[PDB]
Amino acid sequence: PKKRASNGRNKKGRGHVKPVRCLNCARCVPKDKAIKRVTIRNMVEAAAVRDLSEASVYAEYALPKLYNKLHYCVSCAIHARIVRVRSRTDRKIRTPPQRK
């Protein structure tokens, strides 16, 4: 039977969407279907932000962030636990998980 009313993607009122490669395995996946995560990480881990600040020649120098947008196919994402199998009724919930 039909598992999702959206067919597991985000294509409505459209014929074709150009693909993207999974970050992990380089599989061609449609752009609307790929699991996309925007990550803004500190370039230096919090353990090393102190000793690196002491070694700085600049007073009050802000460490730059690392900006990245990750694309995963369904297999890449499920295996890495980026997304998980949800119950039949919990699948419909499409609000971001309440973690942050």
Partner RNA sequence: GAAGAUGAUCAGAUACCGUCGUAGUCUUAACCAUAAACUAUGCCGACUAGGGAUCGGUUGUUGUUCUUUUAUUGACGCAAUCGGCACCUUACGAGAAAUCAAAGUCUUUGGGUUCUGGGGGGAGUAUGGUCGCAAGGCUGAAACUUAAAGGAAUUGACGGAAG
Question: Which residues lie near Zn ion (CB under 5 A)?
Answer: 27, 73, 75
Q: Is residue 73 a known part of a binding site?
A: yes
Residues 9-48 within binding reach of RNA (CB under 7 A): 11-14
Whole-number Å distance between alpha carbons of 21 and 25: 8
Quick check: 7 binds RNA (CB under 7 A)? yes
Q: Which does 69 bind (CB under 5 to 8 A by kind): RNA, Zn ion, none?
A: none
Q: Phi and psi dihedrals of 77, rounded to 5?
A: -75, -45
Among 84, 95, 96, 100, binds RNA (CB under 7 A): 84
Quick check: 96 binds RNA (CB under 7 A)? no
Residues 6+ apart with CB under 8 A from 30: 9, 11, 17, 18, 19, 20
Q: Side chain identity at 88, as an amino acid letter?
A: R
